[PDB]
Enzyme design. Structure first.
Site, short mmCIF file in Angstrom:
data_model
loop_
_atom_site.label_atom_id
_atom_site.label_comp_id
_atom_site.label_asym_id
_atom_site.label_seq_id
_atom_site.Cartn_x
_atom_site.Cartn_y
_atom_site.Cartn_z
N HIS A 105 42.21 36.90 40.65
CA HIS A 105 42.39 38.15 41.38
C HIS A 105 41.72 38.09 42.76
O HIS A 105 40.80 37.31 43.00
CB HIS A 105 41.79 39.34 40.61
CG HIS A 105 42.32 39.52 39.22
ND1 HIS A 105 41.67 40.30 38.29
CD2 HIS A 105 43.42 39.02 38.60
CE1 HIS A 105 42.35 40.28 37.15
NE2 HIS A 105 43.41 39.51 37.31
N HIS A 171 44.48 41.34 24.56
CA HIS A 171 44.93 40.63 25.76
C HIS A 171 46.21 39.88 25.44
O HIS A 171 46.28 39.16 24.44
CB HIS A 171 43.88 39.64 26.28
CG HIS A 171 44.18 39.13 27.66
ND1 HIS A 171 44.89 37.96 27.89
CD2 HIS A 171 43.89 39.64 28.88
CE1 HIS A 171 45.03 37.79 29.19
NE2 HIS A 171 44.43 38.79 29.81
C1 LIG Z 1 42.46 36.54 31.51
S1 LIG Z 1 43.64 35.46 31.27
C2 LIG Z 1 42.08 36.81 32.89
C3 LIG Z 1 42.91 36.32 33.90
C4 LIG Z 1 42.60 36.54 35.22
C5 LIG Z 1 43.50 35.95 36.19
O1 LIG Z 1 43.39 36.12 37.40
S2 LIG Z 1 44.67 34.86 35.46
C6 LIG Z 1 41.42 37.23 35.54
N1 LIG Z 1 40.65 37.69 34.56
C7 LIG Z 1 39.42 38.37 34.95
O2 LIG Z 1 38.32 37.61 34.35
C8 LIG Z 1 37.32 38.55 33.86
C9 LIG Z 1 37.16 38.39 32.34
O3 LIG Z 1 38.45 38.61 31.76
P1 LIG Z 1 38.56 39.53 30.43
O4 LIG Z 1 39.99 39.45 30.02
O5 LIG Z 1 38.19 41.01 30.83
O6 LIG Z 1 37.55 38.97 29.32
C10 LIG Z 1 37.77 39.96 34.29
O7 LIG Z 1 37.13 40.30 35.53
C11 LIG Z 1 39.29 39.82 34.43
O8 LIG Z 1 39.82 40.75 35.39
C12 LIG Z 1 40.93 37.50 33.27
C1 LIG Z 2 47.30 40.17 34.12
C2 LIG Z 2 46.73 38.85 33.58
C3 LIG Z 2 47.72 37.70 33.77
C4 LIG Z 2 45.36 38.52 34.17
O1 LIG Z 2 45.35 38.57 35.57
C5 LIG Z 2 44.38 39.56 33.65
O2 LIG Z 2 43.75 40.29 34.45
O3 LIG Z 2 44.20 39.69 32.42
#
Ligand SMILES: *C(=S)c1cc(C(=O)S)c[n+]([C@@H]2O[C@H](COP(=O)(O)O)[C@@H](O)[C@H]2O)c1
Ligand SMILES: CC(C)[C@@H](O)C(=O)O
Ligand code: NI
Length: 425
Positions: A105, A171
């Site tokens: 992100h 998720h």
């Molecule tokens: C899960 S696949 C995931 C994927 C992304 C991508 O950009 S791809 C980002 N995040 C971020 O990582 C942190 C932890 O994830 P959780 O799913 O909340 O445990 C969190 O800041 C997510 O936004 C996750």
């Molecule tokens: C939307 C998914 C692909 C990831 O960016 C997340 O925030 O869980």
């Protein structure tokens, strides 16, 4: 009448009385009266770990991973006890980094850091963002047997004490969020994430909400997180009104699995049979800021929609479609079939393409009607969904298509619920 999650406000929808099942909601477990007091207790008596104070003894530096804006973690409740313990252990505030685990992100803004962490914490501690496209900010830790290289933010890798905080929710790829996911992908480079979020993982039938064991996504990000290490996690679960219902602290795997064991008892909501029309949300603010994230409401509904049925989603999309890379894929691939030809037959990797692959998974099973005032209808119509002005209109349209026997299920909290078909019901 039902209130769907929708931005900061919710959305009041009237659904047909004779057609609509009782809303799918998570089980009403008791909130903790004093979740910060509970965090304090769990830091002193954690799961599979020494007490945090003992872990922090003699450590010179600490890195604390926090979720970015898209996760409604009540971070100050978790962080104030952690930060007090670290100060007691002798770490000075300048020795502590709060690292925003963005994954791929965009970085959090200054205002978001205040929204996420409180003004007091955001002003006192160094708070920095992970940048997944900057390989130079990452350290290589090895390559997994599946061939995925582990590239993890060097600020975390080099810290004496590694701490991760987060939130256990369903998720659509990793089964549940939390624990290890703060490391992979939270602070992992695109060189890692492009492969882990590649079709060889995402097309697996168990790369889906609720699946951990046997889901290669979860097996792989657990393995990658363990190559980096994590000395201590604190994770919470939240009910529909965002009250903390459980706190787990300690070992990154054992505490996470204890939290999952609890959330599995509350998030599952069953219907006796799949239905032609599923009304859902993107879980409101902050998750529903972008269309990119709102695809999660669509994948979350898939288990209970009949093949060829219609998912009606409401989402505020206050920030729009998502990243420039994500948006460019809709221009480069006007059809999902062409997009999937691109990424299935060669090693083709573009930032954020995995959510387009998830949207293709949705559209292979269901039609989508999308209700939002955050993105114009003309734009949404280029995103492989049908914009409809209101949920009530969308449902009326779908019910005419499927006929007088068709039923409606509604999921007010969207992807924070785990809908299932239970024929015994
Ligand atoms: C899960 S696949 C995931 C994927 C992304 C991508 O950009 S791809 C980002 N995040 C971020 O990582 C942190 C932890 O994830 P959780 O799913 O909340 O445990 C969190 O800041 C997510 O936004 C996750
Ligand atoms: C939307 C998914 C692909 C990831 O960016 C997340 O925030 O869980
Ligand atoms: Ni991801």
């Amino acid at each position: 009448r039902v209130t769907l999650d929708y931005g900061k406000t919710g959305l009041n929808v009237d659904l047909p009385d004779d057609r609509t099942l009782p809303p799918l909601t998570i089980r009403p477990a008791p909130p903790l009266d004093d979740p910060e007091a509970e965090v304090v207790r769990c830091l002193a008596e954690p799961i599979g770990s020494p007490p945090l104070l003992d872990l922090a003894r003699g450590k010179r530096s600490a890195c604390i991973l926090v979720c970015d804006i898209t996760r409604p973690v009540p971070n100050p409740v978790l962080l104030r006890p952690i930060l007090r313990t670290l100060h007691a252990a002798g770490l000075a505030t300048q020795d502590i980094l709060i690292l925003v685990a963005t994954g791929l992100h965009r970085p959090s803004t200054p205002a978001e850091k205040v929204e996420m962490l409180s003004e007091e914490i955001a002003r006192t501690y160094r708070v920095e963002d992970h940048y997944g496209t900057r390989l130079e900010e990452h350290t290589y830790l090895g390559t997994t047997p599946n061939g995925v290289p582990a590239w993890i933010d060097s600020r975390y890798v080099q810290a004496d004490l590694k701490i991760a905080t987060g939130l256990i929710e369903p998720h659509l790829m990793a089964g549940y969020s939390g624990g290890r996911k703060l490391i992979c992908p939270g602070i992992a480079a695109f060189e890692t994430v492009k492969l882990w979020h590649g079709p060889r993982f995402l097309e697996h039938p168990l790369a889906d909400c609720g699946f951990l064991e046997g889901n290669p996504v979860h097996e792989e990000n657990t393995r990658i997180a363990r190559m980096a290490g994590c000395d201590f996690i604190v994770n919470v679960t939240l009910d529909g009104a965002r009250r903390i219902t459980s706190v787990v602290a300690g070992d990154m795997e054992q505490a996470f699995l204890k939290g999952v064991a609890f959330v599995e008892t509350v998030v599952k909501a069953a219907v006796p049979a799949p239905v032609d029309v599923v009304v859902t949300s993107s879980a409101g603010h902050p998750l529903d800021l972008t269309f990119y994230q709102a695809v999660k409401g669509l994948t979350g509904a898939l288990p209970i929609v009949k093949p060829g049925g219609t998912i009606v989603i409401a989402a505020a999309l206050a920030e729009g479609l998502g990243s420039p890379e994500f948006q460019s894929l809709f221009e480069e691939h006007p059809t999902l079939e062409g997009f999937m030809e691109a990424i299935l037959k060669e090693e083709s990797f573009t930032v954020d393409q995995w959510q387009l692959e998830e949207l293709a998974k949705v559209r292979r099973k269901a039609r989508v009607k999308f209700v939002s005032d955050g993105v114009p209808a003309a734009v949404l119509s280029r995103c492989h969904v049908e914009p409809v002005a209101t949920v009530e209109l969308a449902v009326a349209q779908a019910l005419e298509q499927y006929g007088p026997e068709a039923r409606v299920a509604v999921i007010p909290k969207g992807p924070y619920v785990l809908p299932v078909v239970d024929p015994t019901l």
